[PDB]
Amino acid sequence: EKEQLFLQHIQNLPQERLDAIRGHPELVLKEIDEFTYPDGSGVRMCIGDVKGGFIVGKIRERKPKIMVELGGYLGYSAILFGNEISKIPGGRYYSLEVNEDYAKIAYELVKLAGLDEIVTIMIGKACDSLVELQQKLLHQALDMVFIDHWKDLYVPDLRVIESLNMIAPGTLLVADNIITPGAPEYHKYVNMSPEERRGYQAKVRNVNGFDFIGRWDLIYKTETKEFDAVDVTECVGYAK
Numbered sequence: 001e002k003e004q005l006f007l008q009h010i011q012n013l014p015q016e017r018l019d020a021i022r023g024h025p026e027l028v029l030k031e032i033d034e035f036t037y038p039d040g041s042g043v044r045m046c047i048g049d050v051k052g053g054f055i056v057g058k059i060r061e062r063k064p065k066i067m068v069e070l071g072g073y074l075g076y077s078a079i080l081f082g083n084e085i086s087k088i089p090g091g092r093y094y095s096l097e098v099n100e101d102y103a104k105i106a107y108e109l110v111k112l113a114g115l116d117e118i119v120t121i122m123i124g125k126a127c128d129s130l131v132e133l134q135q136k137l138l139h140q141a142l143d144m145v146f147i148d149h150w151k152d153l154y155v156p157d158l159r160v161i162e163s164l165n166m167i168a169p170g171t172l173l174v175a176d177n178i179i180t181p182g183a184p185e186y187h188k189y190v191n192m193s194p195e196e197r198r199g200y201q202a203k204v205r206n207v208n209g210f211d212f213i214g215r216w217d218l219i220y221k222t223e224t225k226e227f228d229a230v231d232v233t234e235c236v237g238y239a240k
């Protein structure tokens with residue numbers, strides 16, 4: 001819709017401009033940041049400079065080899081963090097986006113950024129794509145996960161990740177918009193003890209399916225970082 005206007009803008013840039021920014025993630029991000037729609041507004045829902053910088057710091061510190069984001073929109077975070085993943089040998093970035101129209105646009109921006117060999121966009125519901133990703137990785141656990149899609153799916157999709165044994169000691173979770181609009185359920189979940197999560201999981205049906213009850217035997221450590229806020233959750237071991 002609106003998003004097609006943005007894609008048209010990029011595709012209609014002069015060749016000299018495309019040649020100038022091609023293969024330069026930071027420059028492609030700036031073209032996204034500086035675009036204005038006819039009504040005067042900008043591209044929405046992008047992770048942005050300040051939160052983005054914080055997360056970039058975590059990636060440089062922890063050097064995740066496998067990073068997954070839930071919710072890609074037009075490719076901004078995939079480009080920002082995929083660029084960081086580039087610097088890490090063997091590193092791969094997976095973006096799980098439900099809207100095919102959005103994903104197609106993100107695919108072009110990611111390619112223009114020079115990140116096509118590093119970033120893979122999976123189209124479909126995150127819960128479905130995670131099942132498929134697990135099949136592809138068995139050939140195991142995720143190193144870092146950026147959770148940035150619909151707030152009501154934070155805990156259901158996290159429980160899917162848990163159930164697929166994609167969370168292990170060393171795995172870091174970064175969840176966006178903890179305050180605005182808010183994800184209180186998620187914030188509650190990742191601050192729960194293993195025993196608390198065991199009861200929650202038995203009590204609260206995963207809307208994604210009975211088979212995705214989750215894994216309570218994970219020890220979590222969570223810090224909220226305020227800027228709005230993001231929750232930073234590390235699995236630090238398996239629970240007794």
Ligand SMILES: C[S@@+](CC[C@H](N)C(=O)[O-])C[C@H]1O[C@@H](n2cnc3c(N)ncnc32)[C@H](O)[C@@H]1O
Binds near residue numbers: 045070075099150153
């Ligand atoms: C905040 S935007 C993601 C922004 C992106 N991470 C960035 O910073 O550039 C939320 C996105 O989640 C997507 N979404 C909603 N439900 C989803 C689901 N079940 N699985 C995957 N993506 C979903 C929407 O299509 C939307 O593009």
